[model samples]
Target: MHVIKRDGRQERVMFDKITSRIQKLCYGLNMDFVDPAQITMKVIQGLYSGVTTVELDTLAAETAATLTTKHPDYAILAARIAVSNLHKETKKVFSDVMEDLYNYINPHNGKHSPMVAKSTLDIVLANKDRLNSAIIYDRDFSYNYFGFKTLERSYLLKINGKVAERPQHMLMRVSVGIHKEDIDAAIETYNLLSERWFTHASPTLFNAGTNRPQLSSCFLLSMKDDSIEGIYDTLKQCALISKSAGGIGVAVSCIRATGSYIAGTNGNSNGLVPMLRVYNNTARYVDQGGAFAIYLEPWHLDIFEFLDLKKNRARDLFFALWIPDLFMKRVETNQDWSLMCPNECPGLDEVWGEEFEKLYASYEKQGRVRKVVKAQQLWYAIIESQTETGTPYMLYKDSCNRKSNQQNLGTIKCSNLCTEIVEYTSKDEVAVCNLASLALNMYVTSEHTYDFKKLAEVTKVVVRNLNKIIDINYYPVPEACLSNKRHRPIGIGVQGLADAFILMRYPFESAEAQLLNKQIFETIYYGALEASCDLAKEQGPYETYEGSPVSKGILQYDMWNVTPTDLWDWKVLKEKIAKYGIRNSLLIAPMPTASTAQILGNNESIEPYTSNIYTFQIVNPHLLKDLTERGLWHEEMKNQIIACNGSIQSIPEIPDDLKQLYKTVWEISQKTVLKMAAERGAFIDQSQSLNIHIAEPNYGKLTSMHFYGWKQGLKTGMYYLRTR
Candidate 1:
């Protein structure tokens, strides 16, 4: 058989050459379990006449990935093959590749369409040799198979639909784009980013070096007002933020309910159902470029319609509740709950806590309530919506406002799309947060120790990078710019908590794992605060930092009424904060690192493994490695896991410790997850994206879960309800 080479020459297929190539990439892998010959044979079997060499390599890599059930090292080998294939196809020099991106032109339209911004190109050209020398191209091989594939598909800058920039090139571009003239800082950021220590959010990666660099990940906007001009203006703003690839959370509680008077048109309003339909279509029209979540207070007269939107065909849009403490109390007491029209009930959306209770109750006494139902009736609908659609994400307005440092700013309207961002949004200002997530597993030392010192060091770097991002980010709208500059919030989340737990040999629900989880957040919170305070010393505090909780010497832990452990010196950090203030108003928002986590081969942010067998294509690498070490991994064992639907609890051959370490999200009690979230909540000033996974969720189960999170004082009660 003959194979087509890159140059279009037909060459005789050589079996040994492919074997040797796979063998070379297998260095340091477990030779006992990883057999390159097996992969070669599979590749040979899949080969057709005149198959391209690229196709052969892809086939070989995929074959290796399929063998990951046998050993985790096969996944590494798969990534190596894929990375090596790309390296061979792409330009070796970073500067040269960037120049190609800078000089790219539209093949059809024949216009100068540069992918790299001119400013970034100029800086890279000025220091070509130095920047080129800084990139360790071999680091490209560090990604797992799926991680590299994700980068190849969406990330890496492309020229005319074809990828032109390597992973290292993309990292270098992002680094330079962020630092601009500061080359040393750029290199430092590049090294840490490429080494898998942490990663900037997707928009930052996609547009950092591009002409329009919209680097902020989360944008929270309250309706400009509740009128025609206001509604369309807000819609336009959503489109703009979406066009620039920023996720948005829009507060629509201020919009009037159905049949409410429209003064200008002299007619009745259509309420949230129709308005949200327009927003939903806009979200779909924007496609993958943007994500949106609509936030509403439960007091709205159209609450049932708003809850039903997600259950209908509004899949493009996400739904979340901007819940008040009174609502929870009413539901718990089984009392009557009143739903009102915002037009009649004037300032209901603008207040929270006792003030909110007073206004709402006064409105009820004044007989303005449009509908009255048992609070449990409304609660059942919310839970029913969750059971069917897994959404209308639950968040507590009182917990969010009461515990927030931004409470000084306003009632703190809503959280961002992932529900992690809890910043203050107003009519004139759109809340914005730039994000980056630390790869938690990276801090696991080879000697089985958690490296707090290194985690703190990396977290400090992340804070500085994200802080810099706030200044340099391209604002989608002037409102976002206004809010970002004033508050200067940044989200420092994490990925691979499960990996870290496995590396430490601690069970997911173990005491040791729980402590480590809390301590990790504590350390990150401390490091981020220290870094921000250091920046404050250099550049002074954020514009609105004067009235914030941190300014008054209270930290997140203090807000939670929980004292810190002696892991870090809280008193010293507090003293430093009081002396110099903090650069950012809010810090340490643990966002859901969905895409970035995939790019780094980490589990989703702070989530337990959803399954041991992921999608039938791959096994959990950690579990596979452990099973292989113990001679418990084989084809039958793999089939058993698949048959059990990703559970190892029933597999008798697996040891108790292995089973404990590998418990899926369903296997572990979600209450433990909530407890862990609350434990870390003391340090997480800006909330977390906590998902509650249930095999089969009932009203009772979900009701208890929501109340547990609310009472525990979590800002974001739950991002989503994942069910089997």
Candidate 2:
């Protein structure tokens, strides 16, 4: 039989040659973890006579990559195969690759259209040979299949339909682009990155050394004004930011709600729902490339409607209602709800804390309600949405702006996507943050123990990466760029906390795990401080660093009146920090890894596992019986847990310890979660992305949780709410 090649050439196929080729490419891999013959056998089973050599290689690599869940080492071999295939298909020299991209003429227009940015081309041309030789192609093999695939899919610079830059080339470009003539620093950065110490944020991955590099990811914006012009203008800003690949958090608390009189128009307003629909439409329309988050203060008489926006949406329903939490409660509880307007009696959307309470009560005294329905009435609707649609994520409003360091900045407006990152925003300015995550799962050992040493090691890496990302990232808007570059603020986060617990055989709600979680954040806070201090010694602290609490030597832990542990030489670090200061103004902000979490295949950073068994609904309109995804259901485990009713207390087939280790967040009382957050909140110089989950969050439970976290001195009271 003959196999077809990309060139359309028909070549005689040989069975023996495929096995031999697999054997040849199996070099520099753990032979025990990857057997070429075994893959060859699998390949044989899946083979077709007309399959080309390239197709065969892809099959073999995908098969190998899929086996990564078995042993991490197989991932290495898989990556090598994929990389080798791509390399074999592509050019070797960096200059040549750029030349090819730069000289490309469009197939249709036949006009010279360079994929490489003009300035980037100029820079590359100026430093071609040096840049070319600096990149170590062999380092490409270091990325596991998934990581390499991540780069391949979206990040790497492309030429027409093909990826233009090599992995090592991209790193060199990023390193040089960031440090810019600081060759020693750049080279050090390159070597450390190549060695897998860390990496810059995604935008840096996308646009480093390119002309339109806006690398920063998250931004916070306040609604420009309450009027049509102001609201639309703010939305325009959101679109602009998003166009350049930004995730936004916008505060709409200032906007008046429905039935409020518009003096100029002499008309009653439609309230936040209709206004949010505009923002929601903007979010959808302008999602030219990334996510958007809108925030409204809960005191806003319209808050019940605001929560409904976040319902897990059907495609059709989503188009009808686009807000994150709109009408969410009904799906889970099948309950009726009421929607209200804030215009008639104002201040409901404008205040918080005791002041907020007073203003809301006063508004009620003024008889402000366009409409009023059951609060749990709205609550049940949200539950329905979450049960069906996964979204309109519940963010605790009073909890957020109330416990904000930026509360001093202003009544902090909103949270970024994933309900992490609460920062100040206003008319002229949007808050921006660079983000990176510590690899938490890596700290879990085969010995089933938490490794603080590894945690500290990884935390330090993330701090440095995030710092570098702030320097190298692309900013969608100049305002975001202005905020990011001047402040040099970065968001460092985590994932796999539950996985780490499971691996260590520690129950999620165990006292030991709680303490460990606190210590983990503490270590990260300290490591980030030390790293920032080191940066300050070289480059000076951020422009806005002077006014921040950390500047006066009031460290984050000190804010909570907590003392540091002897875990690290924190006394020495603190003294050094006080003397030299830290480079960035903020550090240790644990962000939501909602999108990136999916990429890393982890639950969002340091969050509780929400469900014992995640139910994924297969799209089968004809069948009401929700059929679980086939082949992966742990029914025996489910029944075992069902007998225990989602508690990990008992289940014989599952090993007592394994069951104990993987307890879902629902199994634990919400109090421990808040206290744990507070315990860690002290050390975090930047606020955390804290999500509070409760199966039944009522006024009492929600209020109690909020007070506990708030009284414990947490800056971010609650990022989101969870209820059945």
Candidate 3:
């Protein structure tokens, strides 16, 4: 058969040429298990007349990826072929590709439609040699099949629907985009990102160095007012933020209940359901494939309707509860819950802690309550919805506010879309946070030791990087700009905790693993605080930093009433923070690293392996290696794992230690997951995107899990109730 070459020349497809191309990319893979000829034969079978060589490479990569179950090394080979194919099709030098991107012309309009910013183009041209030489293109081969595809699909900049940036080029562009003229800092950031030590959130990757560099990840907004003007105004804001690819968490608790009197129209309001329907459509139409998590307090009169919204598959929007401690206490005591309309019961959604308790109790005494129900009844409804729909994420308002470093800003209104960010939002101010996540498994040394020193060093750099992002970010709305500049908040999260545990040979539920989790976060927090303090020494603290908890020498651990270990000197860091004050208002939010984790080939955030087999491929490369070395991995073993739904517990041939190390999240007790979240919560200044997984969730099981997390003082009790 004939194939079209990259240069548009038609040539006959030779089987030997294809076989050699696949074999060349298979270097360093296990030769015994990975056969290039097998993949070549499969490619030949799929080839069509006059097919392009690029398509042949893609088919070969897919064939190799399917062989990953046979040997994990095949995954590396698959990525190599994919990267090789792209390298052949795209320009080799970074500056040349960037130049093409900058001077791009619209084929249809015949207009200069530059994909990158003009200033960025100038900067790249000015230092083209250094920037171009700094990129290590071999790093592109380090990605797995899926991670590379994720980058190719969304992250890498495109020109005329064709990917124009290599993975390494994207890293360099992101680095230079964030650090502008600080060439040294840019190189350092580029190296860290290229080495897989850490990754900036998706928006940063997607927009950095582009025409509009809106790099921040999460935006927190409160409803402007409860009127028609206010509701539509907020909808417009959500639409704007989503247009620029920002995830939204808006507090709609202030919106009046259904049947509430509207003074302007002199009619009953249609309430949150219809209002959210508009938002749901806006989310779909905005075209970023972005998320909007609507936050409402549980005391709102439309709470039940809010819980049922996601059940009817309003799939575009997410629902979350900004739960107060008083509700949990009422549920515990089986006391009465008073639901009131925010229009009539003013200031209830605006307060928290004892002030909220006092205000709510006074409102009930004054007979402002529209409906009263047994608190457990509402609690059961929440559990029922969670079991059915896996949503309406739970975040404890009191714990979030009481322990917040930004509590002085105002009572924190809501968390971000993932429930990780706990920031203050007001009518005029839209809180924003820039995010990055460390690849925790990278810190595990080849000698099987955790590298705390390196982790701390990398964390400090990430802090500086995120801080720089805040200053240079293109804010979608004016209020977000005002809030971000004033507070300068940054979120530093992590991925591959389970991978780290596996690397260290610590069982998921072992005390050693638990202690390691706590210490790792402590190091990150200490390093972030130290870095922010250094920045404060240079630029002064954030505008609202004086009244923050850190300004008073109270750190996140101190707020949680938990003393930190001596991994780093908290006392010395506290003294420095007290002197210079902290630059950022809040730090240390462990987000659910859903997309970035996949690109980096790690477990999602701090979660354990959901299965030994993931979509017909082995989830843990380490487990595959161990099993293969022990001569225990065969067709039957693979089939057994799939048959058991990713569990290895019932497999008789596997050793006990292997079983312990490879236990899926379903096999592990969820109590351990919640406890681990609590343990790490002491170091988390903002919060964590903690998901509770129950195979068959019931009212009693979910209730106990929720109450237990709430009691342990977690700000975000649950991000989602993941179930089978």
- Root-mean-square deviation of each candidate, in angstroms? 1.8, 7.2, 2.2
lDDT of 1 by residue, 292-409 (tens): 8989999999999988767745678899999999999999999999999998999897889999999999999999999899999999999989999899898999888888888798
Per-residue lDDT tens digits of candidate 3, residues 141-207?
9999888888999888888888889999888888988988898899889999999999988888888
lDDT of 1 at 274: 90
Candidates in order have lDDT scores of 0.88, 0.63, 0.88
Instruction: For candidate 2, give the lDDT.
Output: 0.63
RMSD of 1: 1.8
Q: Rank the candidates by TM-score, best first.
A: 1, 3, 2
lDDT for position 76 in model 3: 85
Predicted structure 1, TM vs. truth: 0.97
lDDT of 3: 0.88
Q: In candidate 1, what residue range of length 10 has the lowest lDDT sum?
A: 308-317
Name the best candidate (by TM-score).
1
Better of 1 and 2 by lDDT: 1
